Write a protein that binds this ligand. Structure first.
Ligand SMILES: *C(=O)[C@H](CCCNC(=N)N)NC(=O)[C@H](CCCCN)NC(C)=O
Lengths: 38, 155
């Protein structure tokens, strides 16, 4: 059995760390909900 | 418990307490990714949360009601992954999304890497609205991880 416990509020933090690119990718979505690169 | 907010999805079937994913409670509806729960029911204290709507292809599932989260990335501004990693506290992390170009349309993608257990973490806009959930993407020509901004269709 799976159970849930609370981990925080949904809120934008104004002084948050910034990281990560913005890549543009061509992908297919199979019937299983799995992405793959084309 | 039914308070709006972000939650961890835990289990005791493996060694100790293992976090399998994350979800968003909003308007009395629990929202997570399908592959986190496989669609099985969930416990929230003494109470039971039962699946209500699900789609493996979207990799989304909601509990106690229809999918409530209806905000979308604007395609311009940056967003925040409210990452909730196993063993660690919720940390906002800001990114400009890139784009998954698919035959059926383009969708935002966040290029942030976090262990499984963080699947279902919400992606937010500057206004605080949940524009999608993290944890279903690809691995790029390097070896890192790019998740889609997976959002559902409200009623
Ligand atoms: C949650 O289970 C994770 C979140 C990303 C962890 N991977 C990583 N840091 N490399 N989701 C997955 O691992 C995805 C499995 C679910 C697939 C949905 N049909 N895998 C991918 C490739 O997103």
């Amino acid at each position: 059995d799976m159970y849930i416990e609370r981990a925080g509020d949904i809120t934008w933090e104004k002084d948050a760390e910034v990281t990560g690119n913005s890549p543009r990718l061509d992908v297919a979505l199979d019937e299983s909900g799995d992405f793959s690169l084309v | 418990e039914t308070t709006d907010g972000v939650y961890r999805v835990m289990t005791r079937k493996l060694l100790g307490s293992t976090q399998v994913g994350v979800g968003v409670m909003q308007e009395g509806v629990f929202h997570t990714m399908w592959h986190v729960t496989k669609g099985a029911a969930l416990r929230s204290g003494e109470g039971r949360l039962d699946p209500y709507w699900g789609d493996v292809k979207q990799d989304l599932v909601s509990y106690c009601g229809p999918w409530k989260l209806d905000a979308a990335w604007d395609g311009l501004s940056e967003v925040q992954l409210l990452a909730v990693p196993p063993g660690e506290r919720a940390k906002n992390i800001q990114t400009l999304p890139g784009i998954f170009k698919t035959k059926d349309g383009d969708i935002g993608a966040v290029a942030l890497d976090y262990p499984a257990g963080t699947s279902g973490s919400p992606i937010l806009d500057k206004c605080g609205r949940v524009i999608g959930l993290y944890g279903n993407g690809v691995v790029i020509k390097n070896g890192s991880y790019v998740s889609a901004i997976t959002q559902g269709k409200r009623e």
